[PDB]
Structures are given as structure tokens and as C-alpha cells.
């Protein structure tokens, strides 16, 4: 049924399961072979020396086309799907790959599979916006300094666990094909063991759009070959960012993947609370503490509320909701009292739809039109008694005077 | 298509076709031949002189039984189905036959059949209830007075189209067998030509359960075993759906009830369906199908009610009204933002989040209530704007926690 609530329906974290992020989707790139129909040469070794094949690329030749569809497709380890670039390209030039998702995500695995050898210098980007701003992610190079002005294999400081290192490790060839690079962002971070309480890291994992640019690749020797770029498939793992408030993500009314935000949360990412849940501040539900949102109490007399920080602060960290436009002649933070003109119908429940009633005070026996809104005792004058001030008191006789009804007796 | 809807799908009055009613139904009766096996004599007129035969009845004798199925079966004019009663019985006795239906009907004609001679005295009953209360109709006897305290062949006054007349017609023998009795309720009624606008006649046709009593039979001779007998019964009708259901269907508790279309409810289409009471229920007329009509809630309620004064004061126009307005709704159609939210004019008129909060400036607006129509918040003294955020012409803004706008020279 619902994993968002525990055995006893207790609100517990419900999460979309781990899935590859890039599966079956479109990517905008810089260029690709076949326009104009291009060639590319491929060398193969044997025992002690080399032998080089070479081929051509027309995108209008489907089997000689090598689209990025070869990347998002299923990677058959027995019928590979090699995408191809235009050939003869290198630094200094941006070999740029773009990606706009439309939903903010976190990544765990970053995996690749090669049809080409592994280049030397490249970096990672990301965009927490929808394709407007872009920031890098990590660095990789042999010469971190001369090319990137970077240190080789730097340390991850605790004061900036958002450090981006550069290394020459595993930038090697072999592999000439099928190279396996599995970036794990989780590696090396000293406070990764408690990521559930690493919000800056919980921001480092925040990502909406992704960009990948290359310029440099290795050399050998020394158009014989048409050096190019090629890759067989792509897998990158992550889970849909619902802040721990939705077990999956579905489309919008305008074709947009959104969370069905539970735990009283709203927004495409459960980033905000659901409306009228302005009682305690927004938080993410934790495993030990259900940080769901919570609506305001109006005692069934209003549908809107707001919040102030001092309220929760002065509440000993307990609550801060307050209702607005308290109907049924009610008033208060919980619409929990009748305003001037009405009183509390004590017979009705504490949240009844007509719990506030006007004071039907004796227009003669009561002195005013206001009754005790707590008790309902109307304004009994000098000798007048009774709740609505109707009866005369002991030793007090009713008179037909429209002003002085009850009079003491000696 | 649906006969409940016109050529252009207009919800035209739909009617069950005229069909026989008592075909195949069971009836509990008082007594009949065969218990114990009884005898009975039958006379035949050979041209001029007389000859009387005589027979017996065992109910446990299938071919010598005389079951009431002989009345409900199809009558072969060449293989008649003569039911018979016990013999040695006559007035004064309620020789009564009853029937509990379970569905209200409208009837026009009444037909009979005979294997025995046509007797003299018999009566009619019915129930607008389910076999509990019982009321008569016309009478048939020689002495409408001495027996029924009634006049013979009375007139059908317009002022009482509920008159109960008595006549001697067709109590004769011959026929001694194969007697033919036909009755038309509308005969004599001056107001039968406008039955659709003759509600008393629309009540005069009301019938749910039927009872019929016999007493007398002619002693023509007059040593004999006298009885009563009949070959079949056919009664045509249409299932009472007020013109709002084209038929009647069986219920989940075995109840042949109207499939009430035209927004009508009740086993007879006599009432409106729940949430179908904008104008009260009425019966489909030849001029107007007077169908029921739902309440208007603009997608903002689950229950509704009605008051006639609304329809009264509407110049005969409308009157539905909703209950329990959820999802930021309130009103007769739950059709306004309550003392609370305001109207998001950009959003459609019936959205589940249509009403929008009065986001009044906690400083720049004075009160917490906005002109929920215009959303105009309480702009203070130099403040303008809907939520009262801007200062007005000639007003200097201050960061004061109370008074932002200051007049300018
Ligand atoms: C990209 O890579 C792909 C696959 O390798 C190549 O695909 C070719 O696409 C063309 C489309 O034009 C096709 O060529 C076909 O062969 C014909 C040979 O010429 C004879 O044509 C007929 C018999 O087919 C004879 O009657 C005639 O007298 C010629 O002797 C072409 O002429 C045809 O192309 C014609 O079709 C297009 C519409 O499709 C018309 O607009 C033109 O008039 C054009 O002449 C015929 O369709 C075939 O599908 C592929 N040919 C191959 C693989 O050899 C692309 O050629 C390649 N891109 C480039 C730029 O070469
Ligand atoms: C009402 O109308 C019906 C229909 O016409 C008549 O139905 C009778 O039904 C009985 C039912 O039993 C029939 O009786 C039959 O005749 C036998 C005569 O007795 C001899 O039985 C055998 C030969 O059959 C001999 O060996 C024996 O020595 C007797 O000489 C009855 O004995 C039979 O009935 C027996 O069978 C039932 C089970 O079926 C047993 O439980 C009993 O022991 C019972 O005795 C045999 O069935 C008879 O034929 C029918 N009569 C007809 C068709 O005319 C009723 O008779 C009638 N009512 C009256 C009051 O007459
Ligand atoms: C290569 O570098 C970056 C992207 O990797 C691009 O940056 C450009 O910088 C100039 C500097 O004034 C701007 O005018 C351009 O608008 C930027 N390009 C954008 C924003 O797309 C640069 O254009 C790239 N060169 C290419 C792709 O040929
Ligand atoms: C004949 O007439 C009616 C039914 O046609 C019966 O009326 C009964 O009246 C007595 C009066 O005290 C009541 O106690 C009975 O309950 C009535 N019976 C009904 C209503 O069924 C009358 O009994 C009939 N006579 C019979 C059947 O022998
Ligand atoms: C791989 O699949 C493609 C898709 O049709 C097919 O054309 C090709 O022949 C397959 N590979 C081999 C070796 O057959
Ligand atoms: C109303 O009645 C209560 C009951 O004791 C009393 O304490 C109070 O003073 C009265 N007046 C109010 C609440 O204004
Ligand atoms: C009438 O039908 C019944 C059916 O059982 C049959 O027994 C009887 O002999 C028939 N009689 C005539 C006259 O057709
Ligand atoms: C609400 O706005 C209308 C629109 O001009 C205005 O006429 C009215 O005075 C405002 N206040 C109300 C209706 O209380």
C-alpha cells in the first residue's frame, strides 16, 4: 500500500528506488560524423605490433550512422552500440555535451563504456537550474596545472567537502575500448558516512541539468588516421529528488516529471510544504524523525494560516501556526473564541460549525446586549438573576415597567 | 437509441409498451376442487332441450386438476385451460381472489373468460399499498341497493370522477361457457380526453395489489354440484414509470422496478434522484416531460437540498442548493470564496484550488481581510494596490513597523 507510513501508519521515509538516471533520453551535442560523410581509422594490435583498419560514416547510412541513441539504448556486450563524433577534433575546442532534465536529481554511480580509448584531460559539469547557469563537478588530468591550473590528487578538506580533485590515475590506455570509469562522488568524503546529516553535501548532490565538455586527448607515434570520439553506452545512477516525500515521480499537466509529494509537502521536488501546512517549518523526513509538514488548527473555522519564526522559537520548538479569517463568528489562532457580538455555544463541540451564537440576552431583564462569551451570563441588572437575566431574585418582584422589572422586597 | 431521448437526444418521455401482466404469475386463493377430490356438474344446451353432464376434480390428478395456472397460461382457443373451484359453495361467502404485485401500474381494460356460466354477484378490490389496505370499484349485480347499498348505472360526475357506479350488464347466461366480460375504466368519464392533465384520473389508475370477491351464481333449473370456472386470464398494462423510464428492470433484491431515466428516482420514477432537486419532481406530460434536474454546485459539493419558495420566487425557474462546501468553496453553489481566501480571476471558476488567499501586507495592509472579490487589502492612509504594497501618489515610504507611507509636499 503506502511505504510513506510505518506499520502503524507512522510517517516514514518513502523513496524512489535506485535507477539509472540516463535511460532512453535525448542529449544535445556539438558535432558528429557523417555530415559531411566522414571517415575514421581504427588500429588493432596483435602480439607485438599493430594493424589499422579504417571506415566511413554516413548518418543517412543507418548501420554506418552512429547516433547517441547507441548510448541510451541497452548495452549488449555482444552487439555493441558505438556512437561516433566527427573526426579530427581536439584541444583547444569545447567537445561539449548538454543535458536539461527538468527535475532536480542526485547521482551515486557515474559509469561509462568505451568504443574509443580513454582521453587524458576532461572535466565534469552540472546545473542546478534548467540550462541557464552551469558549474563544474570534478577534474581529471595528468597536467592538472599547465592545462587546468590545478593540483594533482589534492585533499578533501572538511571545511570545503565540496573540493574538486584532479588526478592522472585511470586516465590510461589500455583501455583502448570498453574503458570503465566509475566515478563515485561518495569516495573520499570523511563525513560521507553520515550524509543524511550533510546538507552542504545534500546540496552537492543537487543537480538539474548536466553538461560535459572535452578538449584534450592522448597522442602516440610518431590523414593517415581519422581520429574521432566514440562511446558504446551510458549508465548513471540516482533517485528522484522528493526530499523523502514521494516513492516515485510522475508527469505534470504540462508534461513535466513531478513528485506526488507526500508528508504534507508540495512542489515538483517536495521542496515546499503543502498549502495550509504552515505550522512547523519545512524539513525533510528523517529515518529517526518524521519531519513531515503539518497543517494549522482552525477548529473547523478557517482554511488559511501563516507562520512567524518567534512563535516556533518561543514555543519551545513545538508549533507556530495561526489561522486567518475565522468563520462561524469565531476568532483566534485556532478560531477558538467568538468575537464581539456572539458567544460560545458551550453545548456544541469545541470545533462545531455553529459553536458561536449571538447573545440572546433579555432585552429588558439584561442590561446590555453582550453576554459573557465565556459563560453566557447576560448583563443582569441590580436585582436581576438568571443566565440570560430573565428571572427575578429572591425577594424581587417582576414589574410591568419596561425599564425596572425586578424590585427588592423588605 | 434510448427512447428516453429524442431524435436529437432530447430526454423525451419513454414508456414501457402495453403488455399482459398476469401471464405466468402465482396466486394464493381460498379453495378449489381437488381438496378433497370434488365433483361438479356441467349442463349443455343441445339446440333446444336440456342435457347436464357432471365431472370430478383431483388436484393430485394432473389432467383432472384445475390449477390457477389455467388462468395464467396462454389460452389456446382450441385447448382451453379451465380452472375450477370447489363446489357446494355460494353467497354468502367471500369467494375472494387476491394478488400482491410489488410494482405500481396503470391499467385501462379488464377482460374475463369462462368455462362455467357467468354468475350474478362479484366484486373488485385493489391496494395502492402492498396488500394491506383495500378499495373497490364499480359494481355488478341486479340489486345494487339491496346488496351493495348502491345505485344501478350511476352517472360519472366530473366533480367526482372517483364515482363508483353499479350495473347489471353482461351478467347473463348465455354465455353458460366462454363468457366474455370487457371493462373500460375511462368509459363514462367526461374528463378522460385529458388524462395527462387529469391527476385524479392519474390517481384513479393507481393500482398495486388487486383483490376480487365472488358470492352469487344463478340457479337456472333449479341435485347439482355448483361451482365457478374460467379458461384463462389476460391483463395488459405498462409499468408505472411516470413517463420517465422506458421499462422496469429487476432489482438486486428481486424487484421489477423502473430504470428511471430523465433524472427521476423511486421504483416508479415518482421522485427525483439524489442531487436531482433543482426543481421538484413532476410527471412527464404530453406537453412537457417535466423531468428532474440536478443541483448546481460548480464542482464544489457532494450533497444538496431545495426549497419551493426559491422556485416560487424564481418565477418558476430553479432552486437547487449545495451542502458541505469543501476545497476552499462556499455558497449556494459553493460558488464564492468564504470569509477567507479571494478570487484568483486567472484560474477557472471551479478549480479545486480556485480560491486564493488574501495575501494582505502584514504591515502595508491594515486588516487581514482583502476585498475577496477585488482582493483589495486594507491599504492604510497612503497605501494603494490590491494587497496594499505600494504607496499612493504623494506618499513617502518608511521602514516603520507601522506606518510606511508618509505624505509629501
Ligand atoms: C549516405 O549513406 C547512405 C547509405 O550508405 C546513402 O544512401 C543512399 O541514398 C540514396 C538516396 O538518393 C539511394 O540511392 C538509390 O540508388 C540510385 C542509383 O541511381 C539509379 O537510380 C535508379 C535505380 O534506383 C535508376 O533508374 C537510375 O537511372 C540510376 O541509375 C539513386 O539514383 C537513387 O537516389 C535518388 O533518390 C532520391 C530520393 O530518394 C532522389 O531525390 C534523387 O533523384 C536520387 O538520385 C536511389 O534512391 C540509396 O538509398 C542509397 N544509395 C547507396 C547506399 O548506394 C547515401 O547516398 C549517403 N549520402 C550521400 C550524400 O551519398
Ligand atoms: C388423484 O389423482 C391422481 C392422478 O390420477 C391419483 O394418483 C394415483 O397415484 C398413486 C400413487 O401411488 C398410484 O398408485 C399406483 O397403483 C398401485 C396399486 O397398488 C398395487 O401396487 C402394485 C402394482 O403397482 C402391486 O404389487 C400391489 O400389490 C398393489 O396391488 C399403488 O399401490 C402404487 O402406489 C404405491 O406407490 C407409492 C410410491 O409411488 C408407495 O409409496 C405406496 O406404497 C403406494 O401404495 C402405484 O403408484 C395410482 O396409479 C394413481 N391413480 C391414478 C393415476 O388414477 C390419485 O389416486 C387420485 N386420488 C385419489 C384419492 O384417487
Ligand atoms: C568554448 O568555451 C565556452 C564553453 O565551453 C564558450 O563560452 C563563450 O564565451 C564567450 C566569451 O565572450 C561568449 O561570448 C560566448 O557567448 C560563450 N558561449 C556560449 C555562452 O555558448 C565558447 O563559446 C566555446 N566556444 C565554442 C563552443 O566554439
Ligand atoms: C368476508 O368479508 C371480509 C373480507 O372480504 C372479512 O372482514 C373481516 O371483518 C372482521 C370484523 O370483526 C375482522 O375481524 C376480520 O379481520 C376481517 N377479515 C379480513 C379483513 O380479512 C370477513 O371476515 C370475510 N368473511 C370470511 C372470510 O368468512
Ligand atoms: C546487431 O544488431 C543490428 C540491428 O539490426 C544488426 O543489424 C546487426 O547485424 C547485429 N550484429 C550482428 C553481428 O549481427
Ligand atoms: C465569565 O464567567 C467566568 C466564570 O467564573 C468569570 O470568571 C469571568 O470573570 C466572567 N467574565 C468574563 C470572562 O468576561
Ligand atoms: C391440451 O393440452 C394438454 C397438455 O398436457 C393435453 O393433455 C390435452 O390432451 C390437450 N387437449 C386438447 C383438446 O388439445
Ligand atoms: C471592492 O472592490 C470594488 C471594485 O471597485 C469596489 O467598488 C468596492 O468598494 C470594494 N469594497 C467592498 C466591495 O467592500
Structure description:
This is part of a larger assembly, with two copies of chain A. Chain A is mainly beta and 410 residues long. The first copy, chain A, has a domain at 18-240: Jelly Rolls, CATH 2.60.120. Chain A contains three helices and 22 strands. Chain A has helices at 69-72, 199-204, 309-314; strands spanning 19-20, 38-46, 49-57, 83-84, 95-114, 122-126, 135-140, 182-184, 207-214, 230-240, 249-250, 258-259, 265-266, 272-273, 304-307, 321-324, 330-331, 337-338, 342-344, 356-358, 396-398, 406-408. In chain A, strands 1, 4, 5, 8, 9 and 10 form a six-stranded antiparallel beta sheet that branches. Chain A has a two-stranded antiparallel ribbon with strand order 2-3. Chain A has a two-stranded antiparallel sheet with strand order 6-7. In chain A, strand 6 and strand 7 (135-140) form a beta hairpin. The radius of gyration of chain A is 36 Å and the shape is rod-shaped. Chain A starts with 18 loop residues before the first strand and ends with a strand. The A-B interface holds A 275, 302-304, 324-325, 327 and B 328, 338-341, 353, 357-358, 368-369. The complex binds a molecule of 5 linked components (NAG-NAG-BMA-MAN-MAN) (2 copies), a molecule of 2 linked components (NAG-NAG) (2 copies) and 2-acetamido-2-deoxy-beta-D-glucopyranose (4 copies).
Amino acid at each position: 500500500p503506502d511505504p510513506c507510513y510505518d506499520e502503524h501508519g507512522l510517517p516514514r521515509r518513502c523513496i524512489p528506488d535506485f535507477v539509472n538516471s540516463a535511460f532512453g533520453k535525448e542529449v544535445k551535442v556539438s558535432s558528429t560524423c557523417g555530415k559531411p560523410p566522414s571517415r575514421y581509422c581504427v588500429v588493432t594490435e596483435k602480439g607485438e605490433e599493430q594493424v589499422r583498419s579504417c571506415h566511413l560514416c554516413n548518418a543517412s547510412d543507418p548501420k554506418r550512422a552512429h547516433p547517441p541513441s547507441f548510448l541510451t539504448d541497452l548495452n549488449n556486450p555482444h552487439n555493441l552500440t558505438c556512437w561516433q563524433s566527427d573526426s579530427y577534433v581536439q584541444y583547444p575546442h569545447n567537445v561539449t555535451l548538454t543535458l536539461s532534465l527538468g527535475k532536480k536529481f542526485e547521482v551515486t554511480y557515474v559509469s561509462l563504456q568505451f568504443c574509443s580509448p580513454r582521453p587524458e584531460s576532461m572535466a565534469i559539469y552540472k546545473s542546478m537550474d534548467y540550462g541557464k547557469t552551469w558549474v563544474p563537478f570534478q577534474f581529471y588530468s595528468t597536467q592538472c596545472r599547465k592545462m587546468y591550473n590545478k593540483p594533482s590528487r589534492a585533499a578533501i578538506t572538511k571545511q570545503n567537502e565540496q573540493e574538486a580533485i584532479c588526478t592522472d590515475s585511470h586516465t590510461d590506455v589500455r583501455p583502448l575500448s570498453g574503458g570503465l570509469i566509475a566515478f563515485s562522488t561518495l569516495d573520499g568524503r570523511p563525513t560521507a558516512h553520515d550524509f543524511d546529516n550533510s546538507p552542504v553535501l545534500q546540496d552537492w548532490v543537487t543537480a538539474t541539468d548536466i553538461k560535459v565538455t572535452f578538449s584534450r586527448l592522448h597522442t602516440f607515434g610518431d590523414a593517415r588516421d581519422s581520429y574521432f570520439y566514440a562511446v558504446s553506452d551510458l549508465q548513471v545512477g540516482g533517485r528522484c529528488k522528493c526530499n523523502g516525500h514521494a516513492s516515485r515521480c510522475v508527469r505534470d499537466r504540462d508534461d513535466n516529471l513531478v513528485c506526488d509529494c507526500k508528508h504534507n509537502t508540495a512542489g515538483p521536488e517536495c521542496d515546499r510544504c503543502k498549502p495550509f501546512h504552515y505550522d512547523r517549518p519545512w524539513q525533510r523526513a528523517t529515518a529517526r524523525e518524521a519531519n513531515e509538514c503539518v497543517a494549522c488548527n482552525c477548529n473547523l473555522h478557517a482554511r488559511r494560516c501563516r507562520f512567524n519564526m518567534e512563535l516556533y522559537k518561543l514555543s519551545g520548538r513545538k508549533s507556530g501556526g495561526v489561522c486567518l479569517n475565522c468563520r462561524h463568528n469565531t476568532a483566534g489562532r485556532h478560531c477558538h473564541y467568538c468575537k464581539e457580538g456572539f458567544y460560545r455555544d458551550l453545548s456544541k463541540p469545541i470545533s462545531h460549525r455553529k459553536a458561536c451564537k449571538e447573545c440572546d440576552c433579555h432585552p429588558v431583564g439584561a442590561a446590555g446586549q453582550t453576554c459573557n462569551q465565556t459563560t453566557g451570563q447576560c448583563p443582569c441588572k441590580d436585582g436581576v438573576t438568571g443566565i440570560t437575566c430573565n428571572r427575578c431574585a429572591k425577594g424581587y418582584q417582576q414589574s410591568r415597567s419596561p425599564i425596572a422589572p425586578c424590585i427588592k422586597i423588605p
